[PDB]
Amino acid sequence: TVRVGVSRNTSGAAGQTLFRNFYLLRCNILADGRNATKAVQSHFPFLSRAVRCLSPLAAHCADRTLRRDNVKQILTRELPFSSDLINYAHHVNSSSLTTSQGVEAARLVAQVYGEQVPFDHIYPTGSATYCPGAIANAISRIMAGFVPREGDDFAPSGPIDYLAADLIAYKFVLPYMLDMVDGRPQIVLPSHTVEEMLTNTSLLNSIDASFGIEARSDQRMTRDAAEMSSRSLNELEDHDQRGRMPWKIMLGMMAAQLKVELDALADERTESQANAHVTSFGSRLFNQMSAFVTIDHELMELALLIKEQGFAMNPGQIASKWSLIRRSGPTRPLSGARLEIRNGNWMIREGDQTLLSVSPARMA
Amino acid sequence: DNTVRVGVSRNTSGAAGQTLFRNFYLLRCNILADGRNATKAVQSHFPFLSRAVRCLSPLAAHCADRTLRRDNVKQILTRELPFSSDLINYAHHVNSSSLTTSQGVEAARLVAQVYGEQVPFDHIYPTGSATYCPGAIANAISRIMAGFVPREGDDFAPSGPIDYLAADLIAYKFVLPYMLDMVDGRPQIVLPSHTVEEMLTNTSLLNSIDASFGIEARSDQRMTRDAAEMSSRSLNELEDHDQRGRMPWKIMLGMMAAQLKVELDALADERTESQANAHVTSFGSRLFNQMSAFVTIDHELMELALLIKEQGFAMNPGQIASKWSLIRRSGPTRPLSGARLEIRNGNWMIREGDQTLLSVSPARMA
Amino acid sequence: NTVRVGVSRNTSGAAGQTLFRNFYLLRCNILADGRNATKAVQSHFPFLSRAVRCLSPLAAHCADRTLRRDNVKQILTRELPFSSDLINYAHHVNSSSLTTSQGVEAARLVAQVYGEQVPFDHIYPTGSATYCPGAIANAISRIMAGFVPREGDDFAPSGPIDYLAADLIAYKFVLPYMLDMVDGRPQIVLPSHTVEEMLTNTSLLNSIDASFGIEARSDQRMTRDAAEMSSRSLNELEDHDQRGRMPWKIMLGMMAAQLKVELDALADERTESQANAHVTSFGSRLFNQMSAFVTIDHELMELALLIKEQGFAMNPGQIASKWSLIRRSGPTRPLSGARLEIRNGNWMIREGDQTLLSVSPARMA
Amino acid sequence: TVRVGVSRNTSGAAGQTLFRNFYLLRCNILADGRNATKAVQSHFPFLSRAVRCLSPLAAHCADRTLRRDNVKQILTRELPFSSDLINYAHHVNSSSLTTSQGVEAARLVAQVYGEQVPFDHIYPTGSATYCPGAIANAISRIMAGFVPREGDDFAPSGPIDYLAADLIAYKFVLPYMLDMVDGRPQIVLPSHTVEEMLTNTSLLNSIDASFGIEARSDQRMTRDAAEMSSRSLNELEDHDQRGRMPWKIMLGMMAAQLKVELDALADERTESQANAHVTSFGSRLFNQMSAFVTIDHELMELALLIKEQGFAMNPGQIASKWSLIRRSGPTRPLSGARLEIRNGNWMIREGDQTLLSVSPARMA
Amino acid sequence: ASFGIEARSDQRMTRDAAEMSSRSLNELEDHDQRGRMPWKIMLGMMAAQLKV
């Protein structure tokens, strides 16, 4: 007898994804569960991962021991996906994902960490262009204790950065700008793009972030002494091992990656037209990019436009609006509006109307 | 033993769907998620608009109902809150302002005086009223042309005389309405020079309207081309006869078009639902395909079709509603004198240079 | 070096719940209302659904012909095996809450028409006044599906296949209904006897009839009553020795009787019933799931009418009380004025213009 | 006329079928439905029915009670169409639908089923020629519980084969060849024509197939190791009534019918040239015949030629290549290829390039 | 006489059925212009043509 029981098909499949080449703007489409013909449910996985990477140890703790999976197969191919490369901190020559702005910050990171890490593949020295996402991922991994291998992999051999060991206790983050108005520190609207202040790296001292806990179980109380149980990035005690400047550089780098991808979105006319029915795209983008709006000019304007249009915008409309913002400079008259803080929320108010509102993002 | 098969337990009841603009009649749309394919661009359909274009041959459309339906009509129409769709389906006048229109009452009065003498026409069009529901008049005139008799709470009266043209339109399956104007001292087809409202108010203009009817041979033939047009007759070519209701037919066509335009105008008020269903990208494409019978006789519908084709068949309800409002307010948009009108391969073509600005194929009378 | 064996407690913590463990059909699985805030707990009877699906035994048992051994002997021969498992594997149970004396003549009739080709002693102990209707129903389904039972062990796919089970493969829907000779011709009538009475007088089972129908699901022909072409009635199939028509009718009546006796025994579970007074979907789900048996019996029809009149929102205690009232009192509502009509293949009762009840074909596959 | 009469005409055709007088090669070609271009689409109804018949009970469950058509008048005509006769398993003397090869299997089936069923009309006793399709249909229906009446009818009165009941649960099938390599079972490419195996009934024992269930819950366990939800034909419990060898003979006989029909078509160059414009004919032929590749190497060569040519070949080229394959024998050194079975599929690979692949075949 | 609509890709019915699935001629509501008797006369008359 012969008893070779080769398996055979058992089910089907469903789902869809758009923007294969893109990294942050890649989105996964699922039909609405309640009713098959309601608004499509979009979701950006890599953008959520990037936002969660702001606590690198908690984001990469499992990969230290558990998920030591086969990575050689993914990297070593004729055409590896750009998303995988940027996820594993590899420079890519793709024009849509490479920017020439802020490169001085890139080489600053390289000279900070190149002495003890094979940083050549992350950012080849002397290159006029670089991949912001790759450097952000490299910074996160290095802060997490990992070491990028010359053989295109990661190993948990390096030392743990002190800031990552502190961000374990905190779950919520909220970047914002600061200025010395009337000889005192106060939160201000973003007056610079990340793309421009990554050039003048001294300006990164203006950036500040506030961390705080996901407090103990309590069904109704809105606060657990929210001000007493929170800390700010610039308030932490100074120490050489603390990657505070690398952390702020990583945040700005992720923001720059998002902006360059939005710029490249303009040329993707075919897929934008084919996905005109995806109106949840803009609402999801507004929901998930909330961490980066409080630091940049153009992201703030884009968020304001998205809120004005009612959280329903297919990709082509977002591409056109972003092109308009980039080309026309500051368009909206923000001079009539003011900033305010309400129970931790970061909002722009004009009169009594709430033009914009941003809540703390989730780090893990 | 004892056996009864009257219990029939078959079931083939679909997967899922949805309906939008329930209060509307023509633009009432059925939405189906195309689960057969991975692509999630939802499919859209306008049942009542398809039925209205079907009814251009009233006898072939209404023959099936001469015997079958005897369950209930009054139970629906005489409900607490009868739907405008059902009431206009059974030729009942509707009080809603969104559906009713005030312009073009002259044609309604004309049809009422033509058929009022031999039909209880009061509920179709109350006498002396300024506001009339054009869809109700269209359904009434179609049913009368098919030999029915209306009632206050029913329509199951297949007892009236049957129009000659309603019988003539059994041999044909395709129709192509188009305007015709006296140019160069000879008859010639032209672009739509008047909106339907102007010619309904001044009913003398309807003489310019014309249509062409065609057969559908079921033989396994090669796709027939010119010189096969002998098997086709124009509406105005038919010999005159008292029973033969040509002007009734033209009035029905214009009335249906006016109902569509009134619905489109009222759509602008529906900004809430238009926003709630902004993801229905197939609305523009489906409406563009389905309205193709009316664009050949109206300025504004022609402009809407042209803008739809230029945009690229990607309009949700909000975009089409706003564009329609802009067309209504502005009126003329582009210099169509630069373009020219041509007929080729039995299709109604308007072209500028070499590009085909808009293509219209004759409709399916069914 | 050391072994790496270990476990993580991968579990959300909050999960479902099961109620009425002892009961066979009335066992239900309670799930919170999804991710919604309505807090109307879902209810579902798994064994009742399986019983209704068993009315096409081959399609309902084709999987087990090859795809299981599963060490079911351990389940059957446990120290305290679940009565649900025993009744699922056609084993008699001596529990007073699942055994009835009525209809035993039909039980021994099936036990002797299948007596010699199967070891039927463990299914129905010969001479015992009481018996488990569910066990006999499952035994009939299994044997009709082409199995043979064993005491303690799994069924063996070795016996012959009845012709009716093969015929029923083409159909997906079923609709039992009674018959009567009125005006010299057969016509559908309301139930006149309880399933117990009609089982005791086995000749009455000839009055039962059912009609099956295909499931095309092509998005066409939905409203057409030309679907009468694609249907056949149980009594209309040509007679044959191996076509177990009477076993099929007996199995249907036996399942109905099992449901009845379980409903009767539910009245004694007052503690659990009152502890679970918050699950109001119990009555609605039971009404939805019993729809195949109402057309054949008086008391099930009365219970369905009561549930519909009460708005479908009632808990187990209310169901028990109403069932006891129906059992004790007898016919309550006036059916002389209630007309019985079939429209679009639906078994409905109409009072004037009001539709007192409507029953649709059950899903049989 | 009072008005100009430019108007519409279609003469819209509906329905079309060619290759008449055949059984399997019948194709109801039609114009493309949704696309404006009038490209020719194809489908083989009888071939699909034969492929679905591999689960005989689920294939013939309807006719046991539902259809009961007036078959008597159909086959009693003066010159009834051969396809209808073969569909009801009636022997036909046409030279283009019979072959002397494989008569041993026909004799075996006659002696194994003739003792309880009339069989002379299905296959005349001792005849040197036979129609394979008729015997395949006869064995399928006899497994389905039917009884072939002499008077042009099937009576649902016979016993039901155990394998037919077993196959209800499985919607997907996979035949293949096997060999005793290194003292263990292992899949091999086909090494014999169906003629050799029908003639050598003992050699038929080497054939095997695997079946699989269908569902819609997403596939689990890497979508290829889902093996407890599948079974192999030879692993099923042996029983007198379980028609294992009848099932294998059915599959081989259907394959032989297809081969004989293609060989007969080899001489029909006239109509093939008249219909050579149809190249989707080859694509649909490949798609429907994919179930038969893994048992006969001559069919494998035709499939390989079609795949290399790009899934687009005209009937004339198919005929020429089939004749060339039949005359030549082994055309290429296939030993350079390697056999693999991944993600549930069955494919042969030479080097890294996949030479040919096979997908799930649906039977019910 | 009974009247039936066209079928659709189905040839699988050889059993009993009745009434409004194919409504019969005599059930039609009588009317002065509804020529049932002329129709029956024509049917019989063409049958007689075939006979002669």
mmCIF file of N, CA, C and O in Angstrom, chain D residues 69-131:
data_model
loop_
_atom_site.group_PDB
_atom_site.id
_atom_site.type_symbol
_atom_site.label_atom_id
_atom_site.label_comp_id
_atom_site.label_asym_id
_atom_site.label_seq_id
_atom_site.Cartn_x
_atom_site.Cartn_y
_atom_site.Cartn_z
ATOM 1 N N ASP D 69 -36.391 12.901 -16.358
ATOM 2 C CA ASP D 69 -36.781 13.397 -17.669
ATOM 3 C C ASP D 69 -37.193 12.248 -18.585
ATOM 4 O O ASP D 69 -36.877 11.081 -18.339
ATOM 5 N N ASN D 70 -37.916 12.592 -19.652
ATOM 6 C CA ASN D 70 -38.345 11.618 -20.656
ATOM 7 C C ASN D 70 -37.146 11.275 -21.535
ATOM 8 O O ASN D 70 -36.958 11.803 -22.634
ATOM 9 N N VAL D 71 -36.316 10.361 -21.030
ATOM 10 C CA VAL D 71 -35.105 9.978 -21.747
ATOM 11 C C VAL D 71 -35.427 9.028 -22.895
ATOM 12 O O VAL D 71 -34.627 8.880 -23.827
ATOM 13 N N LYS D 72 -36.591 8.373 -22.855
ATOM 14 C CA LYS D 72 -36.912 7.338 -23.833
ATOM 15 C C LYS D 72 -36.914 7.895 -25.253
ATOM 16 O O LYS D 72 -36.290 7.331 -26.158
ATOM 17 N N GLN D 73 -37.614 9.010 -25.466
ATOM 18 C CA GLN D 73 -37.711 9.575 -26.806
ATOM 19 C C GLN D 73 -36.371 10.084 -27.320
ATOM 20 O O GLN D 73 -36.171 10.143 -28.538
ATOM 21 N N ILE D 74 -35.450 10.448 -26.426
ATOM 22 C CA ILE D 74 -34.186 11.036 -26.861
ATOM 23 C C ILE D 74 -33.319 9.989 -27.551
ATOM 24 O O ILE D 74 -32.808 10.212 -28.655
ATOM 25 N N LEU D 75 -33.143 8.829 -26.915
ATOM 26 C CA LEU D 75 -32.235 7.817 -27.441
ATOM 27 C C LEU D 75 -32.879 6.924 -28.494
ATOM 28 O O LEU D 75 -32.163 6.172 -29.165
ATOM 29 N N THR D 76 -34.198 6.985 -28.659
ATOM 30 C CA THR D 76 -34.894 6.170 -29.646
ATOM 31 C C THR D 76 -34.960 6.823 -31.020
ATOM 32 O O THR D 76 -35.571 6.251 -31.929
ATOM 33 N N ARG D 77 -34.357 7.997 -31.197
ATOM 34 C CA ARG D 77 -34.341 8.635 -32.504
ATOM 35 C C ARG D 77 -33.616 7.756 -33.519
ATOM 36 O O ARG D 77 -32.964 6.765 -33.177
ATOM 37 N N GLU D 78 -33.748 8.127 -34.793
ATOM 38 C CA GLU D 78 -33.065 7.389 -35.850
ATOM 39 C C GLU D 78 -31.557 7.590 -35.769
ATOM 40 O O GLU D 78 -30.783 6.632 -35.883
ATOM 41 N N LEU D 79 -31.121 8.834 -35.572
ATOM 42 C CA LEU D 79 -29.704 9.186 -35.482
ATOM 43 C C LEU D 79 -29.492 10.100 -34.281
ATOM 44 O O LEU D 79 -29.203 11.293 -34.434
ATOM 45 N N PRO D 80 -29.633 9.572 -33.065
ATOM 46 C CA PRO D 80 -29.416 10.407 -31.879
ATOM 47 C C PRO D 80 -27.958 10.823 -31.752
ATOM 48 O O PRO D 80 -27.046 10.118 -32.188
ATOM 49 N N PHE D 81 -27.747 11.988 -31.144
ATOM 50 C CA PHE D 81 -26.394 12.495 -30.959
ATOM 51 C C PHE D 81 -25.619 11.591 -30.011
ATOM 52 O O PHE D 81 -26.148 11.136 -28.993
ATOM 53 N N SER D 82 -24.356 11.330 -30.356
ATOM 54 C CA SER D 82 -23.549 10.408 -29.566
ATOM 55 C C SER D 82 -23.320 10.923 -28.152
ATOM 56 O O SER D 82 -23.230 10.125 -27.212
ATOM 57 N N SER D 83 -23.224 12.244 -27.980
ATOM 58 C CA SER D 83 -22.933 12.799 -26.661
ATOM 59 C C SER D 83 -24.006 12.415 -25.651
ATOM 60 O O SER D 83 -23.697 12.080 -24.502
ATOM 61 N N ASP D 84 -25.275 12.454 -26.062
ATOM 62 C CA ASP D 84 -26.349 12.052 -25.160
ATOM 63 C C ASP D 84 -26.232 10.578 -24.792
ATOM 64 O O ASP D 84 -26.445 10.201 -23.634
ATOM 65 N N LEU D 85 -25.896 9.729 -25.766
ATOM 66 C CA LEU D 85 -25.748 8.305 -25.484
ATOM 67 C C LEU D 85 -24.621 8.053 -24.490
ATOM 68 O O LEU D 85 -24.776 7.261 -23.554
ATOM 69 N N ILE D 86 -23.478 8.718 -24.677
ATOM 70 C CA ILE D 86 -22.368 8.531 -23.748
ATOM 71 C C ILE D 86 -22.718 9.089 -22.376
ATOM 72 O O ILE D 86 -22.290 8.545 -21.352
ATOM 73 N N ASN D 87 -23.489 10.178 -22.324
ATOM 74 C CA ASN D 87 -23.903 10.717 -21.034
ATOM 75 C C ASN D 87 -24.745 9.715 -20.256
ATOM 76 O O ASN D 87 -24.727 9.718 -19.020
ATOM 77 N N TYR D 88 -25.484 8.855 -20.957
ATOM 78 C CA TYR D 88 -26.245 7.772 -20.347
ATOM 79 C C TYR D 88 -25.559 6.419 -20.494
ATOM 80 O O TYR D 88 -26.189 5.386 -20.248
ATOM 81 N N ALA D 89 -24.283 6.402 -20.881
ATOM 82 C CA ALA D 89 -23.482 5.181 -20.932
ATOM 83 C C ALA D 89 -24.092 4.147 -21.881
ATOM 84 O O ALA D 89 -24.515 3.062 -21.478
ATOM 85 N N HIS D 90 -24.132 4.512 -23.160
ATOM 86 C CA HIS D 90 -24.524 3.609 -24.234
ATOM 87 C C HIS D 90 -23.375 3.498 -25.223
ATOM 88 O O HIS D 90 -22.857 4.515 -25.695
ATOM 89 N N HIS D 91 -22.977 2.265 -25.529
ATOM 90 C CA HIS D 91 -21.857 2.050 -26.435
ATOM 91 C C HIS D 91 -22.181 2.583 -27.824
ATOM 92 O O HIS D 91 -23.288 2.397 -28.338
ATOM 93 N N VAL D 92 -21.203 3.253 -28.429
ATOM 94 C CA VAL D 92 -21.319 3.808 -29.772
ATOM 95 C C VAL D 92 -20.202 3.229 -30.627
ATOM 96 O O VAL D 92 -19.061 3.095 -30.170
ATOM 97 N N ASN D 93 -20.534 2.883 -31.868
ATOM 98 C CA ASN D 93 -19.608 2.216 -32.772
ATOM 99 C C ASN D 93 -18.767 3.188 -33.591
ATOM 100 O O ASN D 93 -18.019 2.747 -34.469
ATOM 101 N N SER D 94 -18.877 4.492 -33.338
ATOM 102 C CA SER D 94 -18.092 5.465 -34.086
ATOM 103 C C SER D 94 -16.603 5.227 -33.872
ATOM 104 O O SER D 94 -16.142 5.068 -32.737
ATOM 105 N N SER D 95 -15.848 5.205 -34.973
ATOM 106 C CA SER D 95 -14.411 4.975 -34.878
ATOM 107 C C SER D 95 -13.704 6.122 -34.167
ATOM 108 O O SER D 95 -12.654 5.914 -33.549
ATOM 109 N N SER D 96 -14.259 7.330 -34.239
ATOM 110 C CA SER D 96 -13.652 8.496 -33.610
ATOM 111 C C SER D 96 -13.919 8.574 -32.112
ATOM 112 O O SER D 96 -13.511 9.557 -31.483
ATOM 113 N N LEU D 97 -14.594 7.575 -31.527
ATOM 114 C CA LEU D 97 -14.872 7.571 -30.096
ATOM 115 C C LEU D 97 -14.634 6.200 -29.469
ATOM 116 O O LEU D 97 -15.210 5.905 -28.415
ATOM 117 N N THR D 98 -13.808 5.356 -30.087
ATOM 118 C CA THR D 98 -13.527 4.025 -29.569
ATOM 119 C C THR D 98 -12.051 3.710 -29.760
ATOM 120 O O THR D 98 -11.365 4.316 -30.587
ATOM 121 N N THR D 99 -11.569 2.749 -28.976
ATOM 122 C CA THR D 99 -10.180 2.322 -29.050
ATOM 123 C C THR D 99 -10.079 0.887 -28.558
ATOM 124 O O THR D 99 -10.777 0.497 -27.618
ATOM 125 N N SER D 100 -9.209 0.107 -29.202
ATOM 126 C CA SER D 100 -8.981 -1.264 -28.759
ATOM 127 C C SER D 100 -8.133 -1.309 -27.495
ATOM 128 O O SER D 100 -8.284 -2.228 -26.681
ATOM 129 N N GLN D 101 -7.244 -0.337 -27.316
ATOM 130 C CA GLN D 101 -6.371 -0.319 -26.152
ATOM 131 C C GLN D 101 -7.181 -0.138 -24.875
ATOM 132 O O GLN D 101 -8.172 0.597 -24.845
ATOM 133 N N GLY D 102 -6.752 -0.818 -23.814
ATOM 134 C CA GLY D 102 -7.426 -0.734 -22.535
ATOM 135 C C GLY D 102 -8.675 -1.575 -22.411
ATOM 136 O O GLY D 102 -9.432 -1.389 -21.452
ATOM 137 N N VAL D 103 -8.919 -2.495 -23.348
ATOM 138 C CA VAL D 103 -10.109 -3.335 -23.286
ATOM 139 C C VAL D 103 -10.098 -4.244 -22.064
ATOM 140 O O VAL D 103 -11.160 -4.700 -21.626
ATOM 141 N N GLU D 104 -8.920 -4.526 -21.502
ATOM 142 C CA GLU D 104 -8.852 -5.401 -20.334
ATOM 143 C C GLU D 104 -9.592 -4.793 -19.149
ATOM 144 O O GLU D 104 -10.290 -5.501 -18.413
ATOM 145 N N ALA D 105 -9.448 -3.483 -18.946
ATOM 146 C CA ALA D 105 -10.189 -2.820 -17.878
ATOM 147 C C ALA D 105 -11.690 -2.897 -18.125
ATOM 148 O O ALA D 105 -12.474 -3.069 -17.184
ATOM 149 N N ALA D 106 -12.110 -2.758 -19.385
ATOM 150 C CA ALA D 106 -13.526 -2.887 -19.706
ATOM 151 C C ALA D 106 -14.039 -4.281 -19.371
ATOM 152 O O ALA D 106 -15.131 -4.432 -18.812
ATOM 153 N N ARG D 107 -13.262 -5.315 -19.703
ATOM 154 C CA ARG D 107 -13.661 -6.678 -19.361
ATOM 155 C C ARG D 107 -13.734 -6.859 -17.849
ATOM 156 O O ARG D 107 -14.651 -7.513 -17.335
ATOM 157 N N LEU D 108 -12.769 -6.289 -17.124
ATOM 158 C CA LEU D 108 -12.777 -6.385 -15.668
ATOM 159 C C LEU D 108 -14.027 -5.738 -15.085
ATOM 160 O O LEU D 108 -14.675 -6.303 -14.195
ATOM 161 N N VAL D 109 -14.385 -4.553 -15.580
ATOM 162 C CA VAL D 109 -15.578 -3.872 -15.089
ATOM 163 C C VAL D 109 -16.828 -4.669 -15.439
ATOM 164 O O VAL D 109 -17.761 -4.779 -14.633
ATOM 165 N N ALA D 110 -16.873 -5.233 -16.648
ATOM 166 C CA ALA D 110 -18.033 -6.019 -17.050
ATOM 167 C C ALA D 110 -18.218 -7.228 -16.144
ATOM 168 O O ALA D 110 -19.342 -7.538 -15.733
ATOM 169 N N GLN D 111 -17.128 -7.923 -15.816
ATOM 170 C CA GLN D 111 -17.242 -9.106 -14.971
ATOM 171 C C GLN D 111 -17.430 -8.768 -13.497
ATOM 172 O O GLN D 111 -17.940 -9.611 -12.751
ATOM 173 N N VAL D 112 -17.041 -7.567 -13.057
ATOM 174 C CA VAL D 112 -17.223 -7.200 -11.655
ATOM 175 C C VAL D 112 -18.578 -6.551 -11.385
ATOM 176 O O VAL D 112 -19.030 -6.556 -10.230
ATOM 177 N N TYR D 113 -19.235 -5.992 -12.409
ATOM 178 C CA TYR D 113 -20.566 -5.416 -12.263
ATOM 179 C C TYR D 113 -21.635 -6.093 -13.107
ATOM 180 O O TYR D 113 -22.823 -5.878 -12.843
ATOM 181 N N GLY D 114 -21.261 -6.898 -14.102
ATOM 182 C CA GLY D 114 -22.256 -7.566 -14.922
ATOM 183 C C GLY D 114 -23.073 -8.604 -14.182
ATOM 184 O O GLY D 114 -24.162 -8.963 -14.643
ATOM 185 N N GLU D 115 -22.575 -9.096 -13.047
ATOM 186 C CA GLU D 115 -23.262 -10.140 -12.299
ATOM 187 C C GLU D 115 -24.482 -9.635 -11.539
ATOM 188 O O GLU D 115 -25.241 -10.458 -11.015
ATOM 189 N N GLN D 116 -24.686 -8.314 -11.458
ATOM 190 C CA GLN D 116 -25.849 -7.763 -10.774
ATOM 191 C C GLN D 116 -26.499 -6.621 -11.547
ATOM 192 O O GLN D 116 -27.396 -5.962 -11.004
ATOM 193 N N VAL D 117 -26.088 -6.367 -12.785
ATOM 194 C CA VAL D 117 -26.597 -5.242 -13.566
ATOM 195 C C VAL D 117 -26.528 -5.621 -15.042
ATOM 196 O O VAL D 117 -25.539 -6.237 -15.465
ATOM 197 N N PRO D 118 -27.527 -5.293 -15.865
ATOM 198 C CA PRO D 118 -27.358 -5.487 -17.311
ATOM 199 C C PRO D 118 -26.248 -4.592 -17.839
ATOM 200 O O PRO D 118 -26.178 -3.405 -17.513
ATOM 201 N N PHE D 119 -25.377 -5.173 -18.668
ATOM 202 C CA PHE D 119 -24.157 -4.495 -19.090
ATOM 203 C C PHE D 119 -23.841 -4.628 -20.570
ATOM 204 O O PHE D 119 -22.871 -4.010 -21.019
ATOM 205 N N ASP D 120 -24.603 -5.406 -21.343
ATOM 206 C CA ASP D 120 -24.260 -5.611 -22.747
ATOM 207 C C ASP D 120 -24.311 -4.305 -23.530
ATOM 208 O O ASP D 120 -23.421 -4.025 -24.342
ATOM 209 N N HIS D 121 -25.347 -3.494 -23.305
ATOM 210 C CA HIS D 121 -25.447 -2.222 -24.014
ATOM 211 C C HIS D 121 -24.313 -1.277 -23.637
ATOM 212 O O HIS D 121 -23.833 -0.517 -24.485
ATOM 213 N N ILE D 122 -23.873 -1.304 -22.378
ATOM 214 C CA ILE D 122 -22.763 -0.450 -21.965
ATOM 215 C C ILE D 122 -21.488 -0.859 -22.690
ATOM 216 O O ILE D 122 -20.752 -0.015 -23.215
ATOM 217 N N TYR D 123 -21.209 -2.158 -22.727
ATOM 218 C CA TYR D 123 -20.073 -2.703 -23.457
ATOM 219 C C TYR D 123 -20.450 -4.082 -23.991
ATOM 220 O O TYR D 123 -20.663 -5.001 -23.190
ATOM 221 N N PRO D 124 -20.564 -4.279 -25.309
ATOM 222 C CA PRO D 124 -20.871 -5.625 -25.811
ATOM 223 C C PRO D 124 -19.806 -6.627 -25.391
ATOM 224 O O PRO D 124 -18.611 -6.322 -25.370
ATOM 225 N N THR D 125 -20.254 -7.832 -25.052
ATOM 226 C CA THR D 125 -19.351 -8.845 -24.525
ATOM 227 C C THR D 125 -18.382 -9.309 -25.605
ATOM 228 O O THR D 125 -18.790 -9.651 -26.718
ATOM 229 N N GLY D 126 -17.093 -9.317 -25.271
ATOM 230 C CA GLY D 126 -16.080 -9.813 -26.179
ATOM 231 C C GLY D 126 -15.750 -8.904 -27.339
ATOM 232 O O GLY D 126 -15.001 -9.315 -28.231
ATOM 233 N N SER D 127 -16.278 -7.683 -27.362
ATOM 234 C CA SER D 127 -15.988 -6.768 -28.458
ATOM 235 C C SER D 127 -14.567 -6.233 -28.333
ATOM 236 O O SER D 127 -14.126 -5.858 -27.242
ATOM 237 N N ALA D 128 -13.849 -6.200 -29.457
ATOM 238 C CA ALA D 128 -12.483 -5.693 -29.453
ATOM 239 C C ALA D 128 -12.419 -4.197 -29.174
ATOM 240 O O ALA D 128 -11.395 -3.719 -28.675
ATOM 241 N N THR D 129 -13.482 -3.455 -29.478
ATOM 242 C CA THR D 129 -13.528 -2.013 -29.294
ATOM 243 C C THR D 129 -14.527 -1.657 -28.200
ATOM 244 O O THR D 129 -15.405 -2.448 -27.846
ATOM 245 N N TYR D 130 -14.378 -0.448 -27.666
ATOM 246 C CA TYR D 130 -15.261 0.045 -26.619
ATOM 247 C C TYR D 130 -15.152 1.560 -26.565
ATOM 248 O O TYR D 130 -14.187 2.147 -27.061
ATOM 249 N N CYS D 131 -16.155 2.185 -25.945
ATOM 250 C CA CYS D 131 -16.149 3.624 -25.730
ATOM 251 C C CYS D 131 -15.783 3.897 -24.277
ATOM 252 O O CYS D 131 -16.598 3.610 -23.387
#
